[PDB]
Amino acid sequence: VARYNMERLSLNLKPVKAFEDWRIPVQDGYFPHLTTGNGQEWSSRQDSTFFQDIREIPLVDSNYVSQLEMWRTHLYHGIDVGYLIHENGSYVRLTDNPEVGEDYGINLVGEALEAGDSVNPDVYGNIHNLGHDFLGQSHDPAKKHSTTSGVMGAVETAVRDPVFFRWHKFIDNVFHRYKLTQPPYTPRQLSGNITVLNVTVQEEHWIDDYVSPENLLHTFFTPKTFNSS
Amino acid sequence: VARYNMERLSLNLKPVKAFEDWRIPVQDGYFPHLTTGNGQEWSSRQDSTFFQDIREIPLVDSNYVSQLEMWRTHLYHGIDVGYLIHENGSYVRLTDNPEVGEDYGINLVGEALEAGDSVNPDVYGNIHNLGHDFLGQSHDPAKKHSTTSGVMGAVETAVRDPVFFRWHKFIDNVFHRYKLTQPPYTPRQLSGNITVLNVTVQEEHWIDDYVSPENLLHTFFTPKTFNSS
Amino acid sequence: DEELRQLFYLPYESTSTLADRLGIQLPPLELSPTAVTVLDPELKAKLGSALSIPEGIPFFAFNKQHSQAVKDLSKVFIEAKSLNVLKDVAIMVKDHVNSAVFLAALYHTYYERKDLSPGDTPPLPTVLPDRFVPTFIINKAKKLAKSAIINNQTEVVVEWHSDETGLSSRSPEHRVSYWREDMNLNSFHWHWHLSNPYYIEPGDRDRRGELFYYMHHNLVARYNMERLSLNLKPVKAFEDWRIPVQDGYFPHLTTGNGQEWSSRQDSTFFQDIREIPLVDSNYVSQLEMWRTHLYHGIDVGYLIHENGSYVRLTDNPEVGEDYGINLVGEALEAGDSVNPDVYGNIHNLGHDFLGQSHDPAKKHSTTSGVMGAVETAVRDPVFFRWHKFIDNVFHRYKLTQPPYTPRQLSGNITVLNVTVQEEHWIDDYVSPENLLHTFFTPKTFNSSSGIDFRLKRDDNITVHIKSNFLEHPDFSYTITVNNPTSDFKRMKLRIFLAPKFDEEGVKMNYASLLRYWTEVDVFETDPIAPGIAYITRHSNESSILSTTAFAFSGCSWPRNLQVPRGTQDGMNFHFFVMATDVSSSFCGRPDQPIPDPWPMGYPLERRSSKATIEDFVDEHPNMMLQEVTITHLRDPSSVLRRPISERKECLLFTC
Amino acid sequence: SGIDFRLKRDDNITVHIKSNFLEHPDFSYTITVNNPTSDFKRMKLRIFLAPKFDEEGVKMNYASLLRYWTEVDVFETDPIAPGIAYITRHSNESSILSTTAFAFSGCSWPRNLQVPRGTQDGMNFHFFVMATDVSSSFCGRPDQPIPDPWPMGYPLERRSSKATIEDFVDEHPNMMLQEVTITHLRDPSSVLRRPISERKECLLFTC
Ligand SMILES: *[C@@H]1O[C@H](CO)[C@@H](O[C@@H]2O[C@H](CO)[C@@H](O)[C@H](O)[C@H]2NC(C)=O)[C@H](O)[C@H]1NC(C)=O
Ligand SMILES: *[C@@H]1O[C@H](CO)[C@@H](O[C@@H]2O[C@H](CO)[C@@H](O)[C@H](O)[C@H]2NC(C)=O)[C@H](O)[C@H]1NC(C)=O
Ligand SMILES: *[C@@H]1O[C@H](CO)[C@@H](O)[C@H](O)[C@H]1NC(C)=O
């Protein structure tokens, strides 16, 4: 996300905005122009498409916007009070100053948010993964039209979609929310025996008759070719 | 529902309107002014309250408006094509002209809609019962406020609420939708050996020095008293 | 010339590929910047704008530039000194023109040249199967073909079902997809617009604006009868253009150039089309003002000509005066409009607004949706919402007309009786009188005239495509009439169909039925001798049909969709018959005027003081109102006698 | 009389203002009645107008027509002798009018708007007539009571079990339902005979 924003600033674009108010339609759609080797063209998403309940087939496998919202509410609460509730009933402290043998709070939040090895799936849910699927199925969320998923549904294609970065700005916002609850590093936590005296950056030779001034880096476009056979 | 409407017409009120577009807030609220013997006052519902997803505690026990809508969509489909799909995969014909040993279509729809002995809970759901609970919890649908349920949540109190009859007008509309799919009764189905020649209605004596004209009935208000001890 | 017909074949392949396969002698060739015909400068100079449409996109029939290109190309074809020269010109230009534009120009040419018959054109699905068959099925066919060739198999059949393009259980509009996507109906739509293009030289058609109204009115009416048969509500006009289009459509179609047709999500707004270039744009409020202007003209009874004079609108015209319905049609389509700057181009542009609504500002480098093409537009449920709006405009105009006078409805012939009888179609069953059936039957066609499935030149491969269609048994009807006069009388019988009940089970009154009447048969009889006569017509003779998966050729209402679906229990229809005193009727004839001076659909497109169709018919001895039942059979063999042993007992007399 | 258009005192200037108005020719109607009793009877005739069809071309039922009935003439007649009588009223005598661009003075329904516009082809109206047993009527009289005890607009402002105005009127011998056509002329001279030479041929009997 950070590097994407640096690219946006380079292009006179505004930094990406989190998609956090899920009752607002996603302003920017995306048409991937991709077709799989089985002849299946990836679904697109029109501008101004709502993030909507996914009514699966079978219906019992469905997920809902307000369900994800309540997972989010629960997770925000845990972050704000500094502990998660384990499915076994005990409380787990969140801290990035852990004791030896204690998990890092950022790690616990990450496992709960992705979700992966969550301390409590029933309470904190599966926000980030399902969000990909809500966005990827938003062109046909009740599965009425016998369609394919959009690129947000697959790891090798999701980054293509501008909404990837709106979704991940939301995700990064959750993580930063947690980081802000942590106390600043103490003098001892930042102290060191080595003094830094100087820093210089130098671009290597890349074109005859030009030597880059110190502390200047360049970028440009170059063709690349590969064998698709 | 029919008798309620006759009471409404008697009072110069418009007949009850089904609550069917669940996007529209319920215009008329209800304040029951009831308190249980455990001192727990029944929750009320303000005018213009939305029918909203019920996020239960625990969250895994929740139900959602679009979920009920999809159950409704599935049921409307079955009604319109004249058969339900059994959870065992077979199709069950809906008819009010059944073969000997065949269920009545109106009965099958009723069991699916209530729901009771539904042919397919996963597909047709539990629309009518859950709707009572959605309406009864609509003052606090995400259970944020540690509140009690409204009167729609209990059989001995639900009829008090004007929304009971809006909900049941919707329910009766589903049943009438099914009835309309049935062929008109044939001449043989309506024929009879007995001829009806005359009909007369006569109110009994109820007050001295008055005899009601034929075919005239009266109503009035009278007190009744009971022992609450 | 069956050499002429060959020009329709393999439209996505080079002329060299076609000629090689067919042994057609080629003109001189060269290599384009592969082998392509040399295009003579003399021919090129005659082509107008034909070459301006790039290869690799569909023919967008409602778009003014695309239609102009087809008109410009067909002009050269139509004006060719002979059929030999025509063939030479076609062979020469084929490599240099958009293939869909080429095909459209060729079909139009058969309608316009007097020495060609549209009935001799190939069925459109054999030429462009990609327009009618889902992407997945074409791709499966390519796979089956590749395997077959490898295993020395010269023929393959692929098939598909409606269960595969949408989910009926969650999408009520999908319940009628079989009808909207019917390949013959979509082909009929292509034929209609190429027989009666809005860009035709004015005068070269008679009452073309009125025919635009009439064919589409019948198309909408029959769709509604299909909807009622399926327990769907009749279609609602898309008229408040502020409201998003509720039902989207995903066509699941890909052109032979690999370009998948755009879809439209549920709840998509009808939005301003900001074209590239921007100066070619059109706007919702612009269309709304055209509509406002047209409604005004209709309401006051005259249009304003671009020359400043006023033109009266009347369906009771003087000799030599145009019909008001025709003038409104030309203004609305639009075709030969009296005032383009004032009344605009509402209907055509609306197709393009709907077809581009997934990307109306052209930000996403996308293709158009199916509403943009005549051979695909009927597939989309919004087609019928758009055409219900269009039919509403026409009905708004019809309602301004005075009811037909007694003299305008009077006739010398009396109608005495009407009977309808389904022909034999299954052994050991005879249909009761006045009962018609429908059912689904498979049809198969050879797609190899349209798509080259060969891997290499020497491969012998044929791909057959099989799918299900609504169908009905043949039927006939007999009208008993009396001529009480002293001499022979000739008459035209006018027979129309409409459901008796609406979606609520209420009997439709006269006013409501006006929106439903559809032509069954309108034709002139032999002269009727004094006394009683019996006139019998077979369903294959119907005026709405022309003259093997494709029964009727050229421009024809699909024979297989001639009878509305009806219901399992039997659905009741009015069968109106009128005897009036004196090549599908929906298509008209390019070279001849409409023979009948009465408005199309007469007398059932005007208001009446009569409340019911029963009351209306009872006033006139030359009209009779008959009634038929139409019953859809899920399993046609169900009509057969069942073993006494296997019959089940009913609880309530019938079951 | 309303605006002083003078520049200075001695100027002699008059400004006339001309504009177009809807208008109609005078008309009369005659009601034929029977008094079957043995003595003179006085009655009030109550005459109301409404369109027959709504905007959709559907015949309006009794309930819908209640929203449309408008007074044409409501007045008391001379006593009617036993037997048949003819009662003729001129449009200028209408109860809705009082008693030169301004025909009727004081408080009056405009005489020029006494007849609805109607249409070029002719528009059909119910003309309801009731004989009841015994200064615009819209304005009343400041110093006098309403003479008639019946509600204004009687009997056509209440519900009926009768579905149509036809059914309603058929129940009562003292009511009759007549019908008139009202036709608007863009060019009043169009009603005149046209030269045989200048008449154009119709395609469908009438044009
Ligand atoms: C399927 O359709 C195509 C028509 O285009 C047929 O292909 C032709 O077959 C004949 C006989 O082998 C060849 O001489 C022609 O060259 C073919 N035409 C083309 C354009 O390839 C094919 O025969 C049809 N298959 C069947 C079974 O009728
Ligand atoms: C137009 O109207 C006014 C009425 O106010 C008339 O003006 C009067 O004319 C007479 C005769 O010249 C004068 O003696 C009065 O003093 C005028 N009254 C006022 C208030 O100015 C005028 O005569 C009318 N014109 C015509 C042609 O009738
Ligand atoms: C819940 O699991 C954690 C694992 O770290 C454990 O420390 C805790 O004791 C458990 N709670 C109970 C009461 O079992």
Ligand SMILES: *[C@@H]1O[C@H](CO)[C@@H](O)[C@H](O)[C@H]1NC(C)=O
């Ligand atoms: C520097 O090094 C010492 C010796 O290893 C270490 O104990 C201490 O942490 C460091 N002190 C500072 C100044 O950070």
Ligand SMILES: *[C@@H]1O[C@H](CO)[C@@H](O)[C@H](O)[C@H]1NC(C)=O
């Ligand atoms: C750091 O290095 C740069 C260039 O090598 C030089 O300009 C600067 O004087 C150096 N600073 C120090 C403190 O050595």
Ligand SMILES: *[C@@H]1O[C@H](CO)[C@@H](O)[C@H](O)[C@H]1NC(C)=O
């Ligand atoms: C499903 O249940 C019905 C109930 O009568 C039964 O008839 C049918 O055999 C069952 N289907 C299967 C395949 O088990």
Ligand SMILES: *[C@@H]1O[C@H](CO)[C@@H](O)[C@H](O)[C@H]1NC(C)=O
């Ligand atoms: C009349 O009675 C007979 C004898 O029981 C019975 O068969 C029949 O169904 C009855 N009803 C009619 C309408 O015939």
Ligand SMILES: *[C@@H]1O[C@H](CO)[C@@H](O)[C@H](O)[C@H]1NC(C)=O
């Ligand atoms: C029905 O009963 C009433 C009162 O008993 C009587 O007045 C009327 O005439 C009866 N009708 C018939 C058809 O017997």
Ligand SMILES: *[C@@H]1O[C@H](CO)[C@@H](O)[C@H](O)[C@H]1NC(C)=O
């Ligand atoms: C191609 O196969 C068909 C049978 O499928 C056969 O009739 C025909 O002769 C074959 N074509 C050639 C050129 O062999």
Ligand SMILES: *[C@@H]1O[C@H](CO)[C@@H](O)[C@H](O)[C@H]1NC(C)=O
């Ligand atoms: C405008 O066109 C109409 C078409 O018939 C013609 O009659 C009329 O003369 C034209 N108006 C003028 C003033 O040119």
Ligand SMILES: *[C@@H]1O[C@H](CO)[C@@H](O)[C@H](O)[C@H]1NC(C)=O
């Ligand atoms: C009947 O026939 C006569 C003679 O052709 C013709 O004039 C008349 O228009 C016909 N129709 C009627 C209804 O009189």
Ligand SMILES: *[C@@H]1O[C@H](CO)[C@@H](O)[C@H](O)[C@H]1NC(C)=O
């Ligand atoms: C009409 O034809 C049917 C069947 O042919 C017959 O039963 C019926 O009586 C006929 N009606 C008249 C009026 O001839």
Ligand SMILES: *[C@@H]1O[C@H](CO)[C@@H](O)[C@H](O)[C@H]1NC(C)=O
């Ligand atoms: C009517 O047309 C269909 C399809 O072409 C055909 O099967 C049927 O035999 C035809 N009926 C007659 C008698 O021509």
Ligand SMILES: *[C@@H]1O[C@H](CO)[C@@H](O)[C@H](O)[C@H]1NC(C)=O
């Ligand atoms: C009716 O009044 C108008 C306007 O005042 C007048 O022109 C007409 O002569 C009057 N009719 C009679 C006969 O009084």
Ligand code: CUO
């Ligand atoms: O996770 Cu959201 O795509 Cu790396």
Ligand code: CUO
């Ligand atoms: O069910 Cu809804 O309350 Cu009797």
Ligand code: CUO
């Ligand atoms: O015109 Cu036939 O498609 Cu709108």
Ligand SMILES: [Cl-]
């Ligand atoms: Cl949603």
Ligand SMILES: [Cl-]
């Ligand atoms: Cl499901």
